[PDB]
Amino acid sequence: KVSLVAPHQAIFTNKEVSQVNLPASSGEMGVLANHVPTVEELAPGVVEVIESSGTASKYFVSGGFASILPGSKLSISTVEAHPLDAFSSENIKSLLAEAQKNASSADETVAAEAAIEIEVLEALQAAV
């Protein structure tokens, strides 16, 4: 019973799931059958949802807010949710190398935006 609705398509939609592990801001917590109401912020990690047996679908979420209801409902609202097989290893190295050289090189919000992009690209490349 999950409600992983993004801003482009619906993943879970109907209540037909068992377990789901999504990387939150505090730690890598996972929802079971009927989790408690712990609506916390989701970080840029991997949101895998185990479907009964070993039919889990690894969905690399870009970060959101994993809200849990008290009636056996888990609403994982994220901006982008793509699979791990939809990313290339050669194209991911170009964005991580450009963000490291642009950090601490100017002013305004140019140096602050490069630090957040380098941390999210390093976590997705290590989970291949």
Partner: protein, 72 residues
């Protein structure tokens, strides 16, 4: 003997001070099991095997300390 009888009563009383560690050990595992079971579902499983096995290890300090007090 007067000296042997006085040391036996003091040995059983000084050895009873170790009940604070054994009494708080069973409450420490029970506090985490009561708060952890509300998240679901670690009541009948998952944390059920850890609560039974964890309480037996913490209770070994109270049974070993009580044997030397009754034998003195």
């Amino acid at each position: 003997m007067q000296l042997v009888l006085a040391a036996k009563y003091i040995g059983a009383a000084i050895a009873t001070i170790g009940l604070t560690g054994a009494g708080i050990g069973i409450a420490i595992v029970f506090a985490a099991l009561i708060n952890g079971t509300s998240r679901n579902p670690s009541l009948r499983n998952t944390l059920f095997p850890f609560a039974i096995l964890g309480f037996a290890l913490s209770e070994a300090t109270g049974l070993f300390c009580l044997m030397i007090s009754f034998l003195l």
